[PDB]
Design a protein around this ligand. Structure first.
Ligand code: CLA
Ligand code: CLA
Ligand code: CLA
Ligand code: CLA
Ligand code: CLA
Ligand code: CLA
Ligand code: CLA
Ligand SMILES: CCCCCCCCCCCCCCCC(=O)OC[C@H](COP(=O)(O)OC[C@@H](O)CO)OC(=O)CCCCCCCCCCCCCCC
Ligand SMILES: CC1=C(/C=C/C(C)=C/C=C/C(C)=C/C=C/C=C(C)/C=C/C=C(C)/C=C/C2=C(C)CCCC2(C)C)C(C)(C)CCC1
Ligand SMILES: CC1=C(C/C=C(\C)CCC[C@H](C)CCC[C@H](C)CCCC(C)C)C(=O)c2ccccc2C1=O
Ligand SMILES: CC1=C(C/C=C(\C)CCC[C@H](C)CCC[C@H](C)CCCC(C)C)C(=O)c2ccccc2C1=O
Ligand code: SF4
Ligand code: SF4
Ligand code: SF4
Lengths: 73, 42, 73, 157, 743, 73, 143, 80
């Protein structure tokens, strides 16, 4: 998702969410102190790479150990 | 006529005719000499 | 084992290719002759001149990690 | 004749007036919820919000928790609701610490929908929010205790 | 004001001069290529007619001839199908033993060992088993000999010639006028009554004269060669009366209104014929007659030249309320000016119709021996689902195109569209929240069940045996359907479909055809997953459409076009803001939805319906009813569905199904190949091509057409195209291998 | 199996980082005048030769290794 | 010498029913913008925030949330119609800041009263290597 | 805010100022080129970083350069 989909789509989506919060009663009593924005382009590449690598390592580590220790041989 | 021949010389049509002739030749070669993992004539 | 070792050679060569092209084109290229002024990690240089997505050396690293994971895989 | 009109007659403010937004039933009901009683001590408004939410939270935790079918201890699942009130009272507390400072005035609007000047709600003040968190916590744990206090002659106990 | 025929003579000369000039239609492309990007643009703008010119008449004539060319190609395709059924098929052998013979219509040449794909299909035939279902259609129509398929192929070839000639004619010779295209009332009248009405009537006429009698003789076991020819039922009516007695009257009850006599071959019995497994052909003929009458009537709503009738403009303008202002006023001018608006509407409706076809053809098998050809049924369902999904994504794309190019409030205004634009923010925010809620309350349940089953807590899962989430509404609906015949449907003899009515299990040739479908917690979870995926696809596409012109981030997005990469790294980053990229992402999400849909279909049919029936009535399904317990878990979908049913495709080497084993891996390859494009950007690739160009120029072998990496939009287009191709072809190979082996 | 997999992925990441910091050196620390016409500047001087041949070797290995695997398939 | 026109409140605003793309809390506590134009007649124009509005005859005032929305609307006012336009910035204090056209002349037309800002007097490739500005707050292009 | 710089390779075609969507560029008189005018960036506080000006520069290499710097509310394009 972070590697295929890129930023501008999510920025416009966050804008439509900021309007939603300011116009919703009760919740508009809570104000964010940092403006919501979409992740940076470089940040998106990094976050997508980290998810890719973590899934890579964890998927293979699970299969490796379970297929080997399940038989132990 | 000259425009028709100029169309036949465009890249996709020339590629199809050239690759069709090439595909047919390799098919007949593997038809008269099927399999062959080596160069047997030495 | 002969076929797998050549896949290994493919993985080493391509991962080396990505990292070396990024390291040598990090200070500049025909597309962006002043890349050294923009630093190591920046998003891009805009849609002008045809499009310059993933043109920094950081992006070269980011592309090479996929090939590293594929090679070690 | 049309139903949808601009927000308070101004078309260039990002909103609209609809039966969901501007209607006598909706306007009165929201104006009578404790969070929108802009002239009441926030401690009491917190008590009401805490009592309502602490009372509501007991149901799901008891009927859906892990000990739900072990009736020996499932009724005590209100502790989970009470723990969430504790956690939420922390979320409420840490919110005001960052939002409002000690000497800062109120950030609430000091106007009315009709233009007349108004006294801002003290909820958007440091001490006002502190009273609301304290009220929400006191009413919260009281709502959980009072909900668990009842148990019998109900179709879903 | 008077509808009439209007054409121009010889508007465009027929010559090969413009054949030899690539990119003649565009003014920038016609100069030839300076770089390689030209070569791609020539194909990307090949069918963008409204960007080649601004004259609506030229555009309409081009579109007309393109339709004729498409019809020519479809007729050529049908000619090929019928000709392969006649020349390289075992249809005559499948006609004598439809329950044992595998339908096949393609035989490969023996060149490089591919003759192994010519597998034993029965009837003394070595070929490729077909799942298109043409055998069932040709049997339902009454075709018996290869000669009739030959004649149908020849007729289809002649019709392809006719369509090609008409396409040339209505562009180079008598080319119609703009007002001719814009006579919408006349066109809808002729399409409702002339096209659909008379078409249904013609097919009902064939079915009552050829399909019904020949199929009676086929059901009775008469040898197809010993069956009388169809036209012999049109000469000697004794032959038609010996099968259906009412034909002895001779159209007299029709004119005297004694239609109750025709209940012999025009019935309302419903269900399935237990001998073939398809719907009763008498019911289908009666259906086509009713459809013909209804459409012949409906083709009279719109006024033309004789005063009587409606004008769509008045009907639109008259529909305005207190919530929508002067709604519908202006829509008649929009839909008679913009081709893209009509295309969006028709793509949406045709895709949804294809999906409805996919459902209705599995739940009510229309053709004989279709319900038991599990390969054909699975393939038809999946194919129609994919067609519909793609067409709906295209509807979204063309709606956005209309927004960017044909929308203008100063000339052709509409109040409804303006009101929608004035709260796009609320619409998109609410759809966003609905999507989040559905994602948590469907897939989150699957994660809950996985984590409870892994922790040794099978009673804390959401299951038919633990925390139950029964689809009470759908169960009550199918029950109400079951009890309808004889109550809220007295004319109906059995249930509408077999999935409704309790009992009444129809089986053909030792295999089951249909039975009541169970609905439990698994069905509930999967239906909510489907709703969620549909909602997210709708969110992506509709958000792209509504924000095509302007947004808080880019207030002049319409000037950038419909298809542009970005608007710079600024504003934090503006990648994929164009509506084109919204269609690009909606493609992935439509894939993600349709794949789960078809996997649901496959597992449900292989678990709770399809199987083998005993002589005593013991039905064992292809999988042992494992849908209730295994499909409520992601690990169950991984293990009891993928890992178990992919065996056939990973074991097909050395058999006639090895081609599916090759396509499996090839589609894996192209799917992963797309990830290079989807994860990268063209700047790196251009910098690589720079050094490659150095290497070429060193040896005096650099091309004049300067190589350039793909454009950003082209990068995404290639990425999504390869991603879709790989995924769909992988599922195609897997499905076909599995269902042809275990079917 | 766990130990060999662990160290090979560790080494793969370390190699990507080695080339990453090589590019970071070229941008942040490389002084072209103080490295005038030595081996380091000459690497930049024929960057196209190094990158093109790395590309040829990756193409050669990739074309043939894949082709042989597909042939046997 | 040029004198910027002061912002006159109570100036008519175009006819519009309202949209969700209007002002937010940013206008209340941060800043907002106001574009003004003359126009010859009552027309319809597409809003940079939502749908369509009716441009009133005579002086028009329109308040937006971003500066880019003002210049985009102004550019269309100058292209489709033939209308001159100005726009300002408004802080929550009530202060107004004149923005564009700054000189009263459009920025694409050279004007003699303008001073250079950020103009480097060398080829772009004549910037220095980053090592020569290391440990300093400088950049190779600020010079 | 983002930094924008103009180099003396500018020919004075006024294209960066026309493409700018937030009125950051200006055309000032100069004596270096034929059109007697060069570009300047006096209002980079409104610059969003779209690099639409660089896409329109005919100089090789560019004469407008947009160096993306410290993000602000104005540079991020926020209407909220
Ligand atoms: C299965 C997925 C996949 C595949 C097949 C490739 C393949 C390739 N990558 Mg790649 N990559 C991938 C994923 C993939 N990548 C991903 C996910 C990333 C992260 C973004 C990258 C990032 C990446 C980078 C940064 C680079 C590459 C490079 C390369 C090329 C290396 C040269 C080579 O080995 O010779 C060829 C190997 C092949 C596999 C080619 C196979 C296709 C053959 C030619 C089919 C023959 C055509 C045949 C007639 C079919 C007819 C088709 C018909 C429709 C016309 C190669 C074509 C490097 C490069 O460009 O090399 C110079 C490069 O620098 N890749
Ligand atoms: C680089 C990869 C590669 C390589 C080295 C080979 C090599 C070979 N393949 Mg193979 N193949 C490949 C990829 C590859 N293939 C792929 C990707 C596919 C999938 C599409 C196939 C599918 C395939 C099939 C189906 C078959 C082969 C066969 C063969 C063998 C036949 C040799 C021949 O044609 O006789 C000799 C041909 C010539 C000498 C022609 C050259 C003469 C020229 C035209 C004229 C000379 C003028 C002087 C050969 C050793 C055949 C075989 O039987 O294997 C033993 C065979 O049936 N291949
Ligand atoms: C009873 C009259 C009639 C009939 C049968 C049709 C039939 C058809 N029209 Mg059509 N149309 C009609 C009247 C009719 N139209 C009128 C009055 C108008 C307004 C003036 C239009 C304007 C119109 C447009 C703009 C388009 C169509 C199109 C189509 C085709 C739609 C594709 C399809 O359904 O595939 C089904 C295929 C078949 C049913 C095969 C049967 C085709 C037969 C041989 C055609 C005979 C009908 C024809 C009108 C008779 C005159 C031809 C004669 C002079 C030789 C279809 C064949 C589309 C098209 O051009 O497709 C190419 C399209 O773009 N029509
Ligand atoms: C466009 C559809 C269509 C067409 C082309 C025909 C054509 C024909 N019908 Mg038929 N029919 C149709 C629809 C159609 N029917 C439908 C929908 C019904 C159900 C009500 C019937 C019920 C019907 C009966 C009962 C009979 C015919 C008969 C006939 C034939 C007598 C024609 C004649 O000689 O005068 C003729 C070839 C008569 C026949 O068989 O003549 C040999 C006859 O007995 N038709
Ligand atoms: C009746 C249906 C229909 C019609 C008439 C059109 C018509 C049009 N579309 Mg559209 N579209 C449709 C359906 C339709 N579309 C659907 C269902 C989708 C969803 C996928 C889209 C999504 C879409 C997009 C995103 C775009 C268009 C665009 C266009 C315009 C330019 C088309 C062009 O020249 O592209 C040229 C065609 C090609 C370059 C061929 C591409 C090759 C395909 C994609 C892959 C081939 C794979 C093949 C199926 C199987 C593999 C075989 C292979 C191995 C050999 C044109 C007026 C473009 C436009 O500019 O709008 C104005 C635009 O960008 N369409
Ligand atoms: C497996 C990969 C993956 C996942 C998990 C998602 C997930 C999501 N996508 Mg996405 N997407 C993907 C791939 C993926 N996508 C790819 C490859 C693309 C490129 C085509 C896209 C393109 C895309 C678009 C264009 C959009 C989304 C949207 C969404 C969101 C829909 C709302 C929702 O379902 O809420 C529910 C959340 C989930 C289903 C995620 C799992 C949540 C688990 C079950 C709950 C666990 C909570 C737990 C307590 C965590 C606490 C632990 C703590 C200790 C840290 C959702 C979060 C849409 C959106 O923005 O939302 C409206 C949208 O617009 N996606
Ligand atoms: C006359 C055509 C031609 C010639 C002489 C060369 C020559 C060369 N190329 Mg090359 N190349 C070509 C076309 C050609 N290329 C085309 C069309 C493409 C686009 C697919 C490429 C893409 C390409 C890449 C990516 C690379 C090279 C590289 C190289 C060099 C190393 C050898 C090699 O890897 O070749 C391999 C050849 C291919 C991968 C594709 C060749 C396709 C056919 C066989 C060539 C075209 C023939 C032409 C259509 C015939 C015209 C007929 C005419 C009489 C009418 C070498 C000097 C490598 C390099 O940089 O050197 C270190 C390298 O990385 N080429
Ligand atoms: C169709 C159901 C929607 C009913 C709208 C109720 C309805 O039809 O009211 C009708 C209402 C009144 O329309 P008018 O009186 O203006 O109609 C006159 C002309 O416009 C029509 O000729 O339209 C609206 O309310 C505007 C849309 C706002 C409502 C948006 C809510 C969207 C949520 C819908 C999703 C929840 C249900 C999903 C269904 C599975
Ligand atoms: C003794 C012996 C032998 C021999 C061996 C040899 C001959 C060796 C070697 C070796 C080698 C030879 C190795 C290596 C490796 C390497 C590598 C791995 C590399 C690297 C590099 C890099 C990574 C770079 C970085 C950078 C850049 C990029 C730029 C800037 C600068 C720098 C440097 C930072 C034999 C086996 C025969 C036998 C047994 C005994
Ligand atoms: C979903 C998505 C977003 C939206 C994502 C956002 C706004 C991030 C939201 C994160 C929330 C707060 C939850 C994150 C939870 C983390 C697990 C918490 C980690 C925090 C610390 C442990 C570091 C983008 O901004 C984007 C940008 C460019 C390309 C692709 C995408 C993209 O795919
Ligand atoms: C690999 C890749 C490329 C490079 C891809 C290219 C250059 C595709 C073109 C390759 C073909 C093979 C060149 C066409 C060759 C001609 C058909 C002539 C060949 C001669 C005969 C063999 C026909 C991009 O341009 C790109 C752009 C944006 C995001 C990602 C990527 C991306 O991942
Ligand atoms: S699409 Fe490419 S050029 Fe445009 S902002 Fe994204 S990475 Fe940069
Ligand atoms: S990057 Fe965009 S906003 Fe900034 S100066 Fe250039 S054109 Fe203007
Ligand atoms: S676009 Fe470049 S050459 Fe033209 S005026 Fe601006 S800086 Fe000068």
């Amino acid at each position: 998702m972070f590697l295929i989909s890129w930023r501008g789509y999510w920025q416009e989506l966050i804008e439509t969410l900021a309007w939603a919060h300011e116009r919703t009663p009760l919740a508009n009593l809570i104000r964010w102190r940092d403006k919501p924005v979409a992740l940076s382009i470089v940040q998106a590449r990094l976050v997508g790479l980290v998810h890719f690598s973590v899934g890579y390592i964890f998927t293979y580590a699970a299969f490796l150990i379970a297929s080997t220790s399940g038989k132990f041989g | 006529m000259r425009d028709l021949k100029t169309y036949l010389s465009v890249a996709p049509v020339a590629s199809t005719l050239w690759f069709a002739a090439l595909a047919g030749l390799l098919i007949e070669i593997n038809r008269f000499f099927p399999d062959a993992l080596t160069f047997p004539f030495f | 084992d002969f076929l797998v070792h050549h896949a290994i050679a493919l993985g080493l060569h391509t991962t080396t290719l990505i990292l070396v092209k990024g390291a040598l084109d990090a200070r500049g290229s025909k597309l962006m002759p002043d890349k050294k002024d923009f630093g190591y990690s920046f998003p891009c240089d805009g849609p002008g001149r045809g499009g310059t997505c993933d043109i920094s050396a950081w992006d070269a690293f980011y592309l090479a990690v996929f090939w590293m994971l594929n090679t070690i895989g | 004749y049309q139903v949808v009109q601009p927000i308070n007659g101004d078309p260039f403010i990002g909103s609209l007036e609809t039966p969901v937004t501007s209607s006598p039933l909706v306007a009165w009901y929201l104006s009578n919820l404790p969070g929108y009683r802009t002239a009441v001590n926030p401690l009491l408004r917190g008590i009401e919000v805490g009592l309502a939410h602490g009372f509501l939270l007991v149901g799901p935790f008891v009927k859906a928790g892990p000990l739900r079918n072990t009736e020996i201890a499932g009724q005590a699942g209100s502790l989970a609701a009470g723990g969430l009130v504790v956690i939420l009272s922390i979320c409420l507390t840490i919110y005001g610490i960052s939002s409002f400072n000690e000497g800062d005035p109120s950030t609430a609007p000091s106007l009315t929908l009709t233009g007349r000047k108004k006294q801002p709600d003290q909820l958007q003040t440091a001490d006002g929010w502190a009273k609301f968190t304290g009220g929400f916590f006191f009413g919260g744990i009281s709502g959980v205790i009072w909900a668990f206090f009842l148990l019998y002659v109900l179709d879903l106990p | 004001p008077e509808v009439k025929i209007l054409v121009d003579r010889d508007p465009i000369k027929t010559s090969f001069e413009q054949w030899a000039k690539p990119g003649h239609f565009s003014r920038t492309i016609a100069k030839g290529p300076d770089t390689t990007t030209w070569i791609w643009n020539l194909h990307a703008d090949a069918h963008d007619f409204d960007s080649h010119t601004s004259d609506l008449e030229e555009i309409s004539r081009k579109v007309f001839s393109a339709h004729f060319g498409q019809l020519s190609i479809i007729f050529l395709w049908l000619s090929g199908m019928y000709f392969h059924g006649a020349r390289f098929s075992n249809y005559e052998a499948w006609l004598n033993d439809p329950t044992h013979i595998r339908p096949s219509a393609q035989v490969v040449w023996p060149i490089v060992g591919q003759e192994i794909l010519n597998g034993d299909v029965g009837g003394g035939f070595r070929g490729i088993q077909i799942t298109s279902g043409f055998f069932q259609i040709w049997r339902a129509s009454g075709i018996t000999s290869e000669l009739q398929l030959y004649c149908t192929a020849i007729g289809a070839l002649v019709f392809a010639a006719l369509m090609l000639f008409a396409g040339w004619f209505h562009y180079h010779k008598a080319a119609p006028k703009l007002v001719w295209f814009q006579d919408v009332e006349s066109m809808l009248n002729h399409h409702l009554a002339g096209l659909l009405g008379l078409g249904s009537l013609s097919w009902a006429g064939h079915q009552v004269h050829v399909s019904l009698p020949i199929n009676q003789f086929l059901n009775a076991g008469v040898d197809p060669k010993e069956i009388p020819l169809p036209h012999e039922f049109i000469l000697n009516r004794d032959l038609l009366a010996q099968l259906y007695p009412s034909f002895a009257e001779g159209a007299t009850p029709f004119f005297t209104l004694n239609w109750s006599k025709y209940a012999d071959f025009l019935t309302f019995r419903g269900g399935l014929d237990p001998l073939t497994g398809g719907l009763w052909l008498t019911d289908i003929a009666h259906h086509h007659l009713a459809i013909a009458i209804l459409f012949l009537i409906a083709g009279h709503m719109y006024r033309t030249n004789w005063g009587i009738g409606h004008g769509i403009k008045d009907i639109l303008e008259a529909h305005k309320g207190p919530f929508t202002g002067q709604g519908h006023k202006g829509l008649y001018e929009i839909l008679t000016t913009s081709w893209h608006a009509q295309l969006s509407i028709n793509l949406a409706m045709l895709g949804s119709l294809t999906i409805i076809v996919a459902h209705h053809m599995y739940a009510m098998p229309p053709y004989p021996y279709l319900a038991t050809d599990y390969g054909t049924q699975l393939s038809l369902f999946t194919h129609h689902m994919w067609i519909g999904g793609f067409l709906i994504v295209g509807a979204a794309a063309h709606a956005a195109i209309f927004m960017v190019r044909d929308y203008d409030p100063t000339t052709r205004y509409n109040d409804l569209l303006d009101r929608v634009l004035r709260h796009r923010d609320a619409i998109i925010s609410h759809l966003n929240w609905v999507c989040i809620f559905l994602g948590f309350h469907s897939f989150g349940l699957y994660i809950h069940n996985d984590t409870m089953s892994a922790l040794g807590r099978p009673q804390d899962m959401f299951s038919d045996t633990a925390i139950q989430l029964q689809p009470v509404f759908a169960q009550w609906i199918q029950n109400t359907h079951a009890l309808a015949p004889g109550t809220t449907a007295p004319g109906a003899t059995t249930s509408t479909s077999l999935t409704w009515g309790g009992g009444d299990l129809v089986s053909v040739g030792g295999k089951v055809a249909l039975l009541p479908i169970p609905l439990g917690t698994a069905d509930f979870l999967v239906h909510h997953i489907h709703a969620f995926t549909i909602h997210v696809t709708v969110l992506i596409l509709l958000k792209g459409v509504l924000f095509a012109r302007s947004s808080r981030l880019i207030p002049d997005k319409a000037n950038l076009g419909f298809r542009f990469p970005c608007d710079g790294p600024g504003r934090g980053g503006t990648c994929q803001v164009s509506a084109w990229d919204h269609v690009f992402l909606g493609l992935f999400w439509m894939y993600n939805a349709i794949s789960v849909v078809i996997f649901h279909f496959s597992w449900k049919m292989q678990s709770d319906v399809w199987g083998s029936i005993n002589d005593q009535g013991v039905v064992t399904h292809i999988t042992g009813g494992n849908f209730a317990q295994s499909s409520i878990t992601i690990n169950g979908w991984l293990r009891d569905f993928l890992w178990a049913q992919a065996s056939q495709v990973i074991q097909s080497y050395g058999s006639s199904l090895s081609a599916y084993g090759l396509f499996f891996l090839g589609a894996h390859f192209v799917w992963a190949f797309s990830l290079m494009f989807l994860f990268s950007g063209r700047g790196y690739w251009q910098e690589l091509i720079e050094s490659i160009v150095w290497a070429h120029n060193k040896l005096k072998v650099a091309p004049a057409t300067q190589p350039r990496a793909l454009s950003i939009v082209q990068g995404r287009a290639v990425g999504v195209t390869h991603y879709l191709l790989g995924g769909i072809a992988t599922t195609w190979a897997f499905f076909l291998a599995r269902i042809i082996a275990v079917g | 199996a766990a130990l060999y997999t662990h160290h090979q992925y560790i080494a793969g990441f370390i190699m990507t980082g080695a080339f990453a910091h090589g590019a970071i050196f070229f941008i942040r620390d490389y002084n072209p005048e103080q490295n005038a016409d030595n081996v380091l500047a000459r690497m930049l001087e024929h960057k196209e030769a190094i990158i093109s041949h790395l590309s040829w070797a990756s193409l050669f290995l990739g074309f043939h290794t894949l082709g042989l695997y597909v042939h046997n398939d | 010498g040029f004198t910027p026109p002061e912002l006159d409140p109570n100036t008519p605003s175009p006819i519009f029913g309202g949209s969700t793309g209007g002002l937010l809390r940013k206008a209340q506590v941060e800043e907002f913008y106001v574009i003004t134009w003359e126009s010859p007649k009552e027309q319809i124009f597409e809003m940079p925030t939502g749908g369509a509005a009716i441009m009133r005859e005579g002086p028009n005032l329109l308040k937006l949330a971003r500066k880019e929305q003002c210049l985009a609307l102004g550019t269309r006012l100058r292209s489709k119609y033939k209308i001159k336009y100005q726009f300002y910035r408004v802080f929550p204090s009530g202060e107004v800041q004149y923005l564009h056209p700054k000189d009263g002349v459009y920025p694409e037309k050279v004007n003699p009263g303008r001073q250079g800002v950020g103009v480097n007097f060398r080829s772009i490739g004549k910037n220095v290597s980053p090592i020569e500005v290391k440990f300093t707050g400088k950049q190779p292009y600020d010079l | 805010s983002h930094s924008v710089k103009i180099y003396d390779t500018c020919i004075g075609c006024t294209q960066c100022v026309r493409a700018c969507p937030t009125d950051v560029l200006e055309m000032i008189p100069w004596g270096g080129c034929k059109a007697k005018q060069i570009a300047s960036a006096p209002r980079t506080e409104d610059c969003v970083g779209c690099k639409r000006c660089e896409s329109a520069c005919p100089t090789d290499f560019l004469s407008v350069r947009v160096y993306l710097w410290h993000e602000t509310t104005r540079s991020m394009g926020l209407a909220y």
